[model samples]
Every structure is written in structure tokens, then in C-alpha cells.
Target: GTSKLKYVLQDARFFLIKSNNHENVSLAKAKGVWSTLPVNEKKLNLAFRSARSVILIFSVRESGKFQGFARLSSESHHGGSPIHWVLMLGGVFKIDWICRRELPFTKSAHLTNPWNEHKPVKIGRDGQEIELECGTQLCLLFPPDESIDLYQVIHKM
Candidate 1:
């Protein structure tokens, strides 16, 4: 069976500006679907700088349940490295859980200059832990669970 899902964005702002030409086009009209793009990417830079956290929620219609949600925040101090984590929980006939390891990056990796140099590590499972290591010092560790097949990327925010 197919399920219908809805998304809601919170703690955000939007603005509309017109073009200089006579055939004026409002910012909303010009941008169209592009306006809905997430700020994490290179296109739109509409980020909540002052806020400690940003949330995205999704709802399921048939079951009236929130299957998944994500929160992006800078509330924790981790030596300036951008830490990304995910957690999943489910229970029916059996219970399951999954999460990402806490990964740390160097200052050079965050800078605009192309000074960061590190080898990409392959995602592997070691017992109950998922391991990803780049170069010598940076490494991410996610504890193992029942699910053996899962992976996600860490986007720059």
C-alpha cells in the first residue's frame, strides 16, 4: 500500500522582491520551487544564524503518525566540527534502532580555501559499530543494531 506524507517547515522566514524591469517578477514568482530548497546547499543561503536549532517534520496521513523527523542545531560544543547524527526506532513484531557515529573534522575542512586533504574511508561494520575514518585523526563510530544495511551522508550546514 502507498502512503501519503506531508512536510512542514518551522522557524523560518520568507520575503518577496520585484525585479527592476517593467516586466516585473516578484521574488516568489521568479524563484518558484527553488525557494523551497534547503539552506544546507549552495543555492539558497537562507539560514537561521541566531537560532540554536532548526527542525523539519513529516506526517503520515493514513496512520496519522510521524514516521521520521530531523533536527539541525549548533547547541552542542564539539571543538567546532560539524557533527551529524541520525536515530531511527520501530516496533511491530520486533524492535529496531539505528544511529550515526559522532564524526569530527578539522578547521581546514571547514574553510573556503582548498587546504583540506584527507582520504575518503569506506563505510564498514565492525561487530555492532559502524566505522568511518578519514586521514589519521578523524573518525566516526555508530553502534551496531539489527539492521546491517544503512548509510547516510554528512552535508555541510
Candidate 2:
């Protein structure tokens, strides 16, 4: 069995108004806006839409210890444009290395998506000193020995 993870809304008042419903507001009040809302899993979901962007921050704790953090942002859109969402990671963790199932440079031209063309291939490796740039695809590996408690923070722009 796995341990439960609870999530609490950091700024409940703002989010409650955005949701604009009695159920959401009442739930937030009953759960206590300033306190952590307990749950049995690591994931939680909230839904809202707005002409302007919204920022949400969640403080997560597991087994009574602070472990990891996550940040999400919803981009502003106009005139029926699709909402762009971005997940931003804080520097509380470290990456050892990445190994992909296939090398991007050697993939067949017929395959439109490199992600779908796969059989495990040992490509080159980078050291911890490597610098990541924008558009870099992060392939993360979470082994049992490296697991930790996690938290989430969100922003909108």
C-alpha cells in the first residue's frame, strides 16, 4: 500500500472567487483555507477558466515532511485561442542522467513523431555539469531508492 498525500489551497479566497460557485467556496471554507486539505494520493485537480491568467500555489507534505515541489501556469489567450499550460520545476531535486529508448538523430524519416519510434537504444550520456536550455526535453527517471515527498506551486501568465 502507498501513503496518502494531501493538498491545501495556498490562497483559497482568490481561487474560490474564480471558481464562482457555492460548492467550491463552501468546500474551501469547510476544509479551512489556511490549512492543508488531507487526501490519500499524490494528485489533485481543480478546474477554472478566465480571460486573464490565474496563479495557484499548493504546499504539499507527505508523512509529515516537506519533500518536493511543482509549479504550473496557465497562459493567457484571446479570441478562442487554446490555453497554454506550462509546468515549471523548482531546484529542490537533481537529475543524474537521461537514457532514451531511441536516439533522435538515428530515427527513420518515415516516423512523424520521434517519441513513438522506440526500442531501447543506448545513446550518449551527459554529466551533472551539463546546462539545459529552453526546448530541452527532460526525460526523468524515478527509481525506488530516489523517491521523495512532493509539493506543488502554480502561477499564471
Candidate 3:
């Protein structure tokens, strides 16, 4: 009998890795993402609602391949109803852009639950040949698990 060495994703701890390239294939490594308020709130609620210890990561509009990922529970807080959400970010490594079909979320991963053609909690995109606000950019809540596989796939530790 023969078997292939398999990797198990530790995604049980919400690995919120949001990919937004048109998805990517960039070379710029980053600590996190930056956008405006209303859009950020729409997404942060989702990221925060999930865990006390959430993991965060992403790609940017500058680079061309992959940036990396990281984990951190944010310490900043604003009183009752934030006007403009500003969550800065954390650590990461590098990995080439892998198509969704390469993973289990095997279906284009882009969404409409607020114009997600890629990932992250974002606003201002109208599904590809479309547009919304001004400085448009984004990413969002992946299945909350497979991200572990995302990490494991790298086996970089």
C-alpha cells in the first residue's frame, strides 16, 4: 500500500486569510491592509464576531504575487459606533498565488455578499466589470478553517 504525505489545516482557529488580486500574484510583502470606514466596518464585524483570537492576512494593490499571513487580536478600540474603522495589522510569510481549484474552497471564491470578487471585508466593487466608491479595495471571511490548510500547505514553519 502506498500513501501520499498529507497536511492537516489547523483552521479551527479562524484563519481569516483574505485574498484580493483580481486575487494576486504579486511580489510585495505586507503586514496588513488599509481602506476606509463603512466598508471596513462591514467586514470587521465579521472578523471580530468569529474569535477572541483572530488571525489576519492579505495581498495589496501594489504587489503582484503573494504577501503573507499573521495572527493578532487587535488592541485598539473606539467608543460606540465607529465612524471610520482603522485596524492596522500583523506578521506574515510568503506563498505563491494558488488557484481556488487547488484548494477545497474550489469555486472562484469571489462573492456578492457585498461585492467580493476575491476576499476581505470590503466595499466598492461591482463584480469585475463594475465599480463602487472611490478608493475601492477588499477581502473577507473564508470558511474559518481551510486557512489552517493554507498555512500547512506552506509547511514553512
Candidate 4:
């Protein structure tokens, strides 16, 4: 049987919890701001239309299955303009070669949103997650009224 999908708010006051007994399972959080001045507006507009809050989370189940999701929101008017707010909740995972070279049987150090690549945020090891808070210096044109779900698949090399 599959687990039921749940909903969560993309606000600064929201929290999350998980329960699992998997040895290789892990989780992490990553957050930062993307500026319209330095980003592609057309693509940004096509995607959301304003500054957004992006929070990404990913977890590995005991069964070796990878699950991921993301949350987005508009800059709260209370936070002021230009410094629009965008939050996300979702991440990605990849195998680490260094870990393989040392402890081939153990988990490796994976990365998310590599330094200069457009990809999902990922991390390795169980119970490891990232948390981010950033502001866009541009006004958010289009606002998302809900959260978005994303996924990542894992494989051994």
C-alpha cells in the first residue's frame, strides 16, 4: 500500500515531521533567494510570475524508495516590495563517488542544485535536510496559491 499524500503551508510558521525505520534513509533542506535582475524573467513568469519562496524536501524510505516534494509562495505584502519572498520545499539525491571510494557499502555525500546547474536540490545520509530563507529584490507578478510536488529517483552506480 502507498502512503497518503498530505498538504502543508509554505509559511515561516509551518513545521514538518517524519517517521521511518530505514537504515539508508536520509533527508535535508536548502533555501535561498533568486533575483529577477539576475534571473530569466520570461522563464520565471512562465513558471510563477513573481518572487517566490522555495522550500524543497526529500526522504528515502526503508524500502529504498526516494520521495521528494517542493513548496512555493508569494512575497507576503507585510515583508515589503522589491524584497519579495519565495519559499520552496523539495530536493534531489545523487550517489557520491568519494563515499564509494572510502566506504563503498555506506552512503555517499550527494549534492542538490549543484553549484551552477539547474537541477533538484539533493543530499545524502539519513536525517540530513537543508533550510533556507531568502528575498527577491523584484516584485512578484504572479503568485502561487498552493504548493507543488516534485520527485527524484535513486540508483546505485
Q: Which candidate is the best by lDDT?
A: 3
- For model 2, the stretches where C-alpha displacement exceeds 4 angstroms are 1-48, 62-72, 75-157
- Tens-digit per-residue lDDT, 72-116, candidate 4: 233222232232223132222221110000111122123222322
RMSD of 2: 19.4
Lowest summed lDDT across 10 adjacent residues in model 3 is found at 1-10
Tens-place lDDT per residue, model 2, 1-157, is 1111112122221110122223432333333221112220011122223212111212121112111112223222224422222112111111111111212222222222222233221111111111111002111111212243322221121
Q: In TM-score terms, which candidate is top?
A: 3
Lowest lDDT 10-mer window, candidate 4?
A: 133-142
TM-score of 1: 0.20
Candidate 3 local lDDT, 1-157, one digit each (tens)? 0010112122212223334442331222222222223444345445445543233334334333213333333422444332222233222222322122122222223432233453423222311211222111111222233423444334432
**Error at 47, model 3, angstroms:** 2.4
Q: Which stretches of candidate 1 lie over 4 Å from their true place?
A: 1-47, 73-157
What tens digits encode model 1's per-residue C-alpha lDDT throughout 1-157?
0011011122222111111221211221222111121222211122335322233221222222222223332222223322121112111110111122212222214212112222222211111111111211111122222222222212212
**Ranking 1 against 2 by TM-score, winner:** 1
RMSD of 1: 21.7
- Give all candidates' CA lDDT scores: 0.20, 0.20, 0.29, 0.23
Candidate 4's TM-score: 0.21
